[PDB]
């Protein structure tokens, strides 16, 4: 068996599926390395998990994502969401709970939107 964990990400109408496997230590957003998600004003808004948690936590494992739906800004937000959620899910399934809880704390320190997308419901008056 291969240690394996999947998560999701949803901005406006954009889907982002993210597999996370234990493996050779890389990151691929749909068949092309994450350094070439194209917007280029947002590539760091994609990196944000990578950087904020430091690399080795990723050096251990392989992350594959595919994204669809929405557009540019929505897809970038969706990938960042899926990466972060996938990281915490894998570290709470096959690795230690201390990493789990402190990762969740680091994220919710920075900006909670990496975890719970807001379903930004319409409002009465």
């Amino acid at each position: 068996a291969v240690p394996s964990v999947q998560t999701f990400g949803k901005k406006k109408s954009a889907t982002a599926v993210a597999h996370v496997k234990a493996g050779k230590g890389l990151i691929k957003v749909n068949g092309s390395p994450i350094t070439l998600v194209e917007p280029e004003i947002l590539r760091f808004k994609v990196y944000e998990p990578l950087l904020l948690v430091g690399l080795d936590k990723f050096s251990n494992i392989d992350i594959r994502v595919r994204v669809t739906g929405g557009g540019h800004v929505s897809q970038v937000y969706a990938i960042r969401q899926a990466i972060a959620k996938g990281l915490v899910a894998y570290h709470q399934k096959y690795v230690d709970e201390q990493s789990k809880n402190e990762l969740k704390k680091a994220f919710t320190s920075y900006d909670r939107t990496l975890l719970i997308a807001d379903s930004r419901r319409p409002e009465p008056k």
């Binding site: 709970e97 809880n101 969740k104 704390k105 919710t108 909670r112 719970i116």
Partner: protein, 103 residues
């Protein structure tokens, strides 16, 4: 919140709300801007029972791994929490730790 928030307590300061959720979690949300300031995972450290008539383990059980009542102390420092399980816990907020766990 990730789960359903089935117990609610509010700080004397009135700036913070402690919320206890069916995933075995207590959160502390600040209320001037609505955001999760500090969380305390509890699911692990609850001494929860196995009834005489059951047919599954008291580890794999899932009837009794959430906190159903919450209250802060009055320095806004500690939480007393209790459930429909065997034990009453007493967390310390600023470090997010368990100070003790009675039976």
């Amino acid at each position: 919140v990730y789960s359903d928030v089935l117990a609610l307590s509010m700080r004397p300061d009135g700036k913070e709300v402690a919320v206890s959720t069916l995933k075995g979690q207590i959160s502390i949300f600040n209320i001037e801007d609505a955001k999760q300031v500090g969380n305390i995972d509890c699911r692990k450290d609850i001494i929860s029972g196995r009834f005489n008539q059951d047919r599954f383990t008291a580890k794999n059980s899932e009837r009794s791994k959430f906190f159903t009542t919450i209250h802060y102390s009055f320095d806004g420092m500690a939480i007393v929490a209790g459930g429909n399980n065997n034990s009453i816990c007493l967390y310390d907020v600023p470090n997010e730790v368990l100070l003790k766990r009675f039976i």
